[PDB]
Amino acid sequence: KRVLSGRVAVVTGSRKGIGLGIAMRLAMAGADVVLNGRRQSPEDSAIVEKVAAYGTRVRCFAANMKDRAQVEALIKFTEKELGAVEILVNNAGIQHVSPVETFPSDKWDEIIALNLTSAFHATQLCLPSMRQRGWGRIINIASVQGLVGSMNKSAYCAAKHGLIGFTKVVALETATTGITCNAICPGYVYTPLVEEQIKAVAEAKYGGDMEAATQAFLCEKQPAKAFVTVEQVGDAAVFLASPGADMIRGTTITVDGGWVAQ
Amino acid sequence: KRVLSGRVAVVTGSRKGIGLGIAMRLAMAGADVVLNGRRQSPEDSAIVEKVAAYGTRVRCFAANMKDRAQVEALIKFTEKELGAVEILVNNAGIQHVSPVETFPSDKWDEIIALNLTSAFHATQLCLPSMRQRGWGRIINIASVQGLVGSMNKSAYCAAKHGLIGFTKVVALETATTGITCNAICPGYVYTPLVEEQIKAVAEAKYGGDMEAATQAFLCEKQPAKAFVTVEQVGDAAVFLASPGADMIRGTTITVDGGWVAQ
Amino acid sequence: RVLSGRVAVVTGSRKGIGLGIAMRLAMAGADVVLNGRRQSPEDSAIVEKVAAYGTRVRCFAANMKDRAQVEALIKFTEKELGAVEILVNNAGIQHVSPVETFPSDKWDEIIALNLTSAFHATQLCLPSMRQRGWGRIINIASVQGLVGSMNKSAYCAAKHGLIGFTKVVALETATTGITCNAICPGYVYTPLVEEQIKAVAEAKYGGDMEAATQAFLCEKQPAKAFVTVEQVGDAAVFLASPGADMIRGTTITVDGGWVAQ
Amino acid sequence: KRVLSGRVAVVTGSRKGIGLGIAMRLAMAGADVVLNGRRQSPEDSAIVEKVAAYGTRVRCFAANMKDRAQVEALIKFTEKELGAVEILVNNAGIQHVSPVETFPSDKWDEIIALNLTSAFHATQLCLPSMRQRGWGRIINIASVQGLVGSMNKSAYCAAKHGLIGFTKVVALETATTGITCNAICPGYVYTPLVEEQIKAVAEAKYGGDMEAATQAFLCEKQPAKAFVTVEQVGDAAVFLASPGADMIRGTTITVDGGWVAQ
Ligand SMILES: NC(=O)C1=CN([C@@H]2O[C@H](COP(=O)(O)OP(=O)(O)OC[C@H]3O[C@@H](n4cnc5c(N)ncnc54)[C@H](OP(=O)(O)O)[C@@H]3O)[C@@H](O)[C@H]2O)C=CC1
Ligand SMILES: NC(=O)C1=CN([C@@H]2O[C@H](COP(=O)(O)OP(=O)(O)OC[C@H]3O[C@@H](n4cnc5c(N)ncnc54)[C@H](OP(=O)(O)O)[C@@H]3O)[C@@H](O)[C@H]2O)C=CC1
Numbered sequence A, B, D: 001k002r003v004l005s006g007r008v009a010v011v012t013g014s015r016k017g018i019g020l021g022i023a024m025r026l027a028m029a030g031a032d033v034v035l036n037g038r039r040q041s042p043e044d045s046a047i048v049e050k051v052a053a054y055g056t057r058v059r060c061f062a063a064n065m066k067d068r069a070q071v072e073a074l075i076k077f078t079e080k081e082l083g084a085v086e087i088l089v090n091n092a093g094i095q096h097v098s099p100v101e102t103f104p105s106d107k108w109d110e111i112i113a114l115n116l117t118s119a120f121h122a123t124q125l126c127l128p129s130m131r132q133r134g135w136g137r138i139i140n141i142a143s144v145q146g147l148v149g150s151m152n153k154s155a156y157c158a159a160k161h162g163l164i165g166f167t168k169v170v171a172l173e174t175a176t177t178g179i180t181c182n183a184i185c186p187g188y189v190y191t192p193l194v195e196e197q198i199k200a201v202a203e204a205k206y207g208g209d210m211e212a213a214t215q216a217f218l219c220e221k222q223p224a225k226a227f228v229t230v231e232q233v234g235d236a237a238v239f240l241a242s243p244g245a246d247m248i249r250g251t252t253i254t255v256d257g258g259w260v261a262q
Numbered sequence C: 001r002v003l004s005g006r007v008a009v010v011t012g013s014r015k016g017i018g019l020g021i022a023m024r025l026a027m028a029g030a031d032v033v034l035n036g037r038r039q040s041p042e043d044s045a046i047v048e049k050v051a052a053y054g055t056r057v058r059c060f061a062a063n064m065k066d067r068a069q070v071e072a073l074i075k076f077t078e079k080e081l082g083a084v085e086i087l088v089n090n091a092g093i094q095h096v097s098p099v100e101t102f103p104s105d106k107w108d109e110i111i112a113l114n115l116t117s118a119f120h121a122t123q124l125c126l127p128s129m130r131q132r133g134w135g136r137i138i139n140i141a142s143v144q145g146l147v148g149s150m151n152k153s154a155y156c157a158a159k160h161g162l163i164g165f166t167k168v169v170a171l172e173t174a175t176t177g178i179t180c181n182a183i184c185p186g187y188v189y190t191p192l193v194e195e196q197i198k199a200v201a202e203a204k205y206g207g208d209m210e211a212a213t214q215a216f217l218c219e220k221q222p223a224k225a226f227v228t229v230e231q232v233g234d235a236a237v238f239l240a241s242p243g244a245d246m247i248r249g250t251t252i253t254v255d256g257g258w259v260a261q
C-alpha cells in the first residue's frame, strides 16, 4: 500500500503540463486518477497508460470545464467508472498577455470562466459526496499571480487572486470536517503556457534568441534563476492530499523559487 | 481652495451607502462628482442637491454597471457634462450569503460580473484619457473579504480578492505615470448590504432581537466592536486621490477596526 | 488644521523621513518634539524651520536604544508641552551585509533601535493615552517589513517585527480611541539610502551616481522614482486624523508599487 | 532507503513539544538527528531511544540557544559526532503573556533573543558548510503569530514576524544554490507551551474548568476547533526537507486549522 492508495482523484486539464505532473505524482502515491482535457485526442491512450504505469486505475474523460454540464458529466463519469471523487484538483487554466487598455473583453471573460468559476462549479458538485463520506481534498492550482500582480496579466492575476479567496472560504466552511481545501501557487514552470510567452519575448526583444529570452524572462521574476518543475508541483499536491495535511486548511503552498519572498 | 478642486470624479453605485459617503467626501474635498445607480429614481434631484451642498458640480447618471455599453455611456456623459474622468471610484457591489454547495450559479456570476468585471470595464474605458492627460486615480472599493475569507461568502470573497489582484496589475502598468490604482478594504459598515445580513442573523439565532444580532455580528469579526462609517471610507478615498498619494500604487488601504490585524 | 493642539513626538527627526513627518504634523497643527542622539549646533535652526507653521516646537536629545533616555524624552515632552498624544517611532539604522558575515553587534543594534525602542516608547506612552481616551502610535516600518531583500537580514527582521508589534498594540487598544498603525515606505532619498547608492556606484558603475541611482531604484521600485519625505509625512497626518479613527493594526504602504509585484 | 536518508539534522529545543515531533518525523524519514535543550536531563536517554526507534543515528547535546558560544558548540559537536549539519531546524522558543503596558523588559528581550536572534546565530554558523557542499535546509519554526497579531503577545508576535522576515532574506541570498530556507507557521498545538496558557486561563476565568478553557482558547482563533499535532508539524518539516521542495524558497507553510484563512 501507498499513502493515497484507494483514493479516487480527478485532475482537470491533465494530459500535459502541470496537470499531468500532478496526475503522475498522485498515481505514484497510490491514487486512482481521471485525466481530462477539452476534446478527445489521439494521445489519450498513451497518456492514460503512462499514468497507469504505477499500478492504479486511470481513466480519461474529455470535458470543457467552462461548461457546467460537462463538469457535471466528468464527475458522474468518475463516480460510475471508479467511485466517489475524493481528491479534486482544479488545474485547467489559460493565459492571455495584454495591457489592460486593449485586453479583449472575451479573453477576460474566458480567463475568469476557466481559471476561477470552473473551480467553483467542480467544487460545488463534489462537496456533497465528500461531506457524506467524511473526507475530501480540494486542491486549487493558483499561481504566484494570485498573490502579487504582474504587468499585462490583469485577467489572470484577478482570476488567480479570486481562486485563492475562494479556497479560503471553502476551507472555512469545511474546517470542522475531514475535508480540506488549499491552493498551490507555482512560479514559472516550463510548460507550453510559458513557452509561448517566452517565444513572444524572443521575437519582440531578442531577435528570436530563445536562450537569451528564457534567461531574461526567468530572471525578471524568479530569484532561483531556474524553473519550478511539474514534478515539484505534483509533490506539493501529494503533500496536501496526505494525512500530514489533515489540518492544513485554506492556505497557499507557494513553490516559486523565491518570487513572493521578495 | 481645496485639494481636489476641479477634479472630475465618477463614483459607481453612489446614491446610498458607502458610495454616497465617498461622493460626499470627494465633493467636500473639492471634486466635481457624478453619481450613479442602475435606474433613475424620484430621489435623484434630492440626492444631487445633498452632495451639491459642498459647492461643486454634481450630476447623476443611471447606468447598470454589469452592461459594458452602459458603463461607456456613463463615462461619455461625464466627459460631455464636466470633462475627462480624472478620478474613477469602482464602488457598486452586491452580496449573496450562501454555503458553497447551494450557492446559485447565476448569483455567483452576477457577483463576479459586478464586483470584479465591471471594474475592469470602467478602468479600461478611462485609462486612455488619463494617460493622455498625465494624471489619474482609479480607486477600487474592495473589502476585508478581498484579503481573508469568511464562511458563506464564496463568490464575494472571490470577486473582492480578484479586484485586489486587478488593482495591483493596473498600478504596475501605470507605475511610471501620474496614474495610480489602489484599493480600499473596509470592514463592516452599517449600510443596507450589512443590515440585511444582521436581520437574517436576528431571525435565525436571536428571535428577531436586532441589538443582540448586531453585537454578535460585529464582534465575530471586528475587534473595535464598532462599525466603520461611510465617511471614513470616503476619507480614505480622499487620501488616495490627494498629491500625498502620488507614489501609493497597487496597495490596499484597510479601514476595518482591526479585522485583518488578527 | 486637523491636528490642532495635539502634542506629537517624532523620534530621529532632525533629518530624513523623520523631519518630513515632523514638518507635516506641524503643518497640520500639531506641537512637535524633535529628537536625535546628541545635541547639535543645528538644533536651533531645525526647530525654527518646523516652528514656521505656528505651533510649539522643541528638540530633545536622547539615544532611543537606552530605555532611560527614551523615558527622559517622554518626561521632557510632558513637562514642556503636555501629554504625548501622537507618538511616531521613526529612528532607525541600516547595515548591508550577507548573512554569513553580518556583524553580531550590528544585528543587535538594528533589533534594538528598529524594533525594541518602539516597544519601549509605546509602553511609556500608552497609560496616558488610555487615561485621556485618545492616542496615535505610528510606526515607521518599511517595505522590508513585508518582503525580504538580499543583504538586509537584520533590518528585514526588525521591520517585520515592528509590523507584528503594531498589530498587537492595535488589538489591545481596539475598543479605545487609541490606534496603532505602521507606514511602510519604499525607497526615499535620504542619507540612509544615499550611502547604499554610493557603495553600489563604487562597486559596479565606476562611481557614477546617476547610473547607480537608477540601477538601485529600478531593482525594486516599479515607479522608477523615489518616494518623498513629504509623502511619508502626509501618510502620518492621515493616520493621525479623525478619518483614521477605525484604521487599526494595518500598514499604509507608500512604495511606488514595490509590494504590488 | 528513505527520502532523507543520510542527511544530518539538528533540531533546537527538541526533547518535548513540537521539536520532538519534528525530530521524530525527520528520523522516520531517514535523517540522523541531534536533539537539544538547555541543560542535561535524566530523561535524555529515553528521549534518544524514542527518536532512535526509526533506525537512524541520534545524539543529544545540551546548549542554551541564547548563548552564541553554546550554539557554536552544538554545531561543532554535530560535526564531530555525525558530520556536516545539512538540515537546521530552529525550533526552540518561549512565550510570555502580558499586555504591552506591563510587559517586562527582560521578558521582551529574552523572547527576541531566543525566538529570533538565536535562529540568526545558528543560520550564520551553518551556512558556510552548506554552501561548500551545495545543499542545505534551514527550517524556521515561526507561528501564525508571525503573520497576524494576538492580544497580550507583543514580544512573541514581533519575534515571530521577524523570524519570517529573516527567512525570506536567507532564502533570497541562497536562491541560486541547493540551500533553501523556509518557515513553518503552526496554529495551536497542545504542547506544554499551550497547556500552561490554558491552565492559567482555566484558573483565572473558567473556575478551573479545563474543558471550557480549552474550548474557548481554541475556538477564539482556530476554525477547525481542533489542535494541530506535533506529528503534523513534523510532516511539514519533512516535506520542506525533501527534494520536492528544492524550489520552495523563502515561504511559509501554515498548518493552522484555518486560522490565517479568516
Ligand atoms: N506554467 C506556469 O508557469 C504556471 C502555471 N500555473 C497554472 O497551472 C495550471 C496548468 O498550467 P500549464 O500546465 O502551465 O498550462 P498548459 O497550457 O501547459 O496546459 C493547460 C491544460 O489545461 C487544459 N485546458 C485548457 N482549457 C481547458 C478547458 N476549457 N477545459 C478543460 N481543460 C482545459 C489543456 O487541455 P487540452 O489542451 O488537452 O484541452 C491542458 O491540459 C493553470 O491553471 C496555470 O494557470 C500556475 C503558475 C505557473
Ligand atoms: N457595507 C460593508 O460592510 C462593506 C461594503 N463594501 C463594499 O462597498 C460597496 C458598497 O457597498 P454598500 O454601500 O455597503 O452596499 P449597498 O447595498 O448599501 O449600496 C449598494 C450600491 O450599489 C448600487 N448598485 C448595485 N448594483 C448596481 C449596478 N448593477 N449598477 C450600478 N449601481 C449598482 C446601488 O444603487 P441602486 O440600488 O441605486 O441601483 C447602491 O448605490 C460594495 O462594493 C461592497 O462590497 C466593502 C466592505 C464592507
Ligand SMILES: NC(=O)C1=CN([C@@H]2O[C@H](COP(=O)(O)OP(=O)(O)OC[C@H]3O[C@@H](n4cnc5c(N)ncnc54)[C@H](OP(=O)(O)O)[C@@H]3O)[C@@H](O)[C@H]2O)C=CC1
Pocket (backbone or CB within 6 Å): C011, C012, C013, C014, C015, C016, C017, C018, C035, C036, C037, C038, C062, C063, C064, C065, C090, C091, C092, C093, C113, C140, C141, C142, C143, C184, C185, C186, C187, C188, C189, C190, C191, C192, C193
Ligand atoms: N530611506 C528609506 O528609503 C526608507 C527609510 N525607512 C525608515 O525611515 C526611518 C528614517 O529613515 P531615514 O530618514 O531614511 O534614515 P536617516 O539615516 O536619514 O535619518 C536617521 C535618523 O535617525 C536618527 N537616529 C539614528 N539613531 C538614533 C538613535 N539611536 N536614537 C535617536 N535617533 C536616532 C538620526 O538622528 P541623529 O543622527 O541626528 O542622532 C536621524 O535623524 C527609519 O526607521 C528607516 O528604517 C523605511 C523605508 C524606506
Ligand SMILES: NC(=O)C1=CN([C@@H]2O[C@H](COP(=O)(O)OP(=O)(O)OC[C@H]3O[C@@H](n4cnc5c(N)ncnc54)[C@H](OP(=O)(O)O)[C@@H]3O)[C@@H](O)[C@H]2O)C=CC1
Pocket (backbone or CB within 6 Å): D012, D013, D014, D015, D016, D017, D018, D019, D036, D037, D038, D039, D063, D064, D065, D066, D091, D092, D093, D094, D114, D141, D142, D143, D144, D185, D186, D187, D188, D189, D190, D191, D192, D193, D194
Ligand atoms: N505550541 C504551539 O501552539 C505553537 C508553538 N510554536 C513554536 O513551536 C516551537 C516549540 O514550541 P512548543 O513545542 O510549543 O514549546 P514547549 O515549551 O512545549 O517546548 C519548548 C522547547 O524549547 C526548549 N528550549 C527553551 N528555551 C531554550 C533555550 N534557551 N535553549 C534551548 N532549548 C530551549 C525546551 O527545552 P528544555 O526546556 O528541555 O530546555 C523545550 O524542548 C516554538 O518556537 C514555539 O514558538 C508555533 C506555533 C504554535
